[PDB]
């Protein structure tokens, strides 16, 4: 519904409800993760090599293949499994 | 704006434990390319002219 002959001073910089929108989106982003799986057992020593690719020595491979131990469903048995990751997710802990 | 990753990916379910599924990356089916975005040159130059004006 329109309003006529009415002058209000607006101020988007000292405005409220953008702080409340930020707080609501932060709390909602937190509230949509508590059902999901924590990746605590994944922090493990990764044996990584470059991906199978005809890579030049100048341009490094963005994707590194990584094989590692991983616990199975059974506590006694562990498996060896491989995956791919990016350069921006792995660091070189410290030949091999 | 158009944005794409052209690297085709295959997800792979690894069982962390009882009812714990982890989704790793499997094979790169096809070429290994670089993800990129595109914008039209003329429209971007025009909008930069507008914001300069």
């Amino acid at each position, epitope marked *: 519904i329109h309003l006529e002959n009415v002058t209000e001073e607006f101020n988007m910089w000292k405005n409220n409800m953008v702080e409340q929108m930020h707080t609501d989106i932060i709390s909602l982003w937190d509230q949509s993760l508590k059902p999901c799986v924590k990746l605590t057992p994944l922090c493990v020593t990764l044996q990584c090599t470059n991906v*199978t690719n*005809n890579i030049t020595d100048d341009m490094r491979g963005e994707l590194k293949n990584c094989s590692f131990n991983m616990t199975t469903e059974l506590r006694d048995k562990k498996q060896k499994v491989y995956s791919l990751f990016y350069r921006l997710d792995v660091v070189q802990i410290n030949s091999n | 704006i158009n944005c794409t990753r052209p690297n085709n990916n295959t997800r792979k379910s690894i069982r962390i434990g009882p009812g714990q599924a982890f989704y790793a990356t499997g094979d790169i*089916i*096809g*070429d290994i*390319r670089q993800a990129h975005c595109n914008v039209s040159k003329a429209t971007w130059n025009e909008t930069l002219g507008k914001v300069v004006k």
Partner: antibody
Amino acid sequence: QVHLQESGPGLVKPSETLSLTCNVSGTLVRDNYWSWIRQPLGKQPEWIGYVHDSGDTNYNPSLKSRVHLSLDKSKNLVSLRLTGVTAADSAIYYCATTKHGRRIYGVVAFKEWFTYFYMDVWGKGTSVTVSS
Amino acid sequence: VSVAPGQTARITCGEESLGSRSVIWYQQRPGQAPSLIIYNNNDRPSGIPDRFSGSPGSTFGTTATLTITSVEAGDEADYYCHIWDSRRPTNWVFGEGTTLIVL
């Protein structure tokens, strides 16, 4: 019209510096890429590599140390040089022109392409055999 | 490969595809020089006959084949593949020999 004339000793002593020459017909050595290709008897061939003016001299990283390629702009020939001929070098050798091609599969500006090569013509070869 | 003359044959060679490939098909006469038939994936030059169908190198996870329709005794040549994969390194040796003979 082109056809090549291979020339070599054919009878080589072991642990020796081999040299080969390749006469041309019509098209000069400046214009085209050149390649040498070896093939043992009853075997698949082995691409030894390609040579061109202005540094385009990529060799096979199999040998990479005991082989050299060169041209002859005055006499208009193509020369192979080899170092330390062993028993696994007895083959038939070929000089051959070759043409490049850009296989492009992605963005050109991201170097997502590669230059393949293919040898269009061949010559008579030289049945190089190493024996003391 | 041994087929009846005047037929279509399919000859496979080389490793399975990983990325995009540019293949070269060569053929060899016994005692004589080699010779080109196919230079791109499905392109043939001038001076060569037709019906040398090349497999498209845009397929991921297949083998590079060579189809020849209406074969003859002049097609008795040891065939060679030379693949150039955008993912695999540069092959300085050719594929294994696939000898086509006729009855």
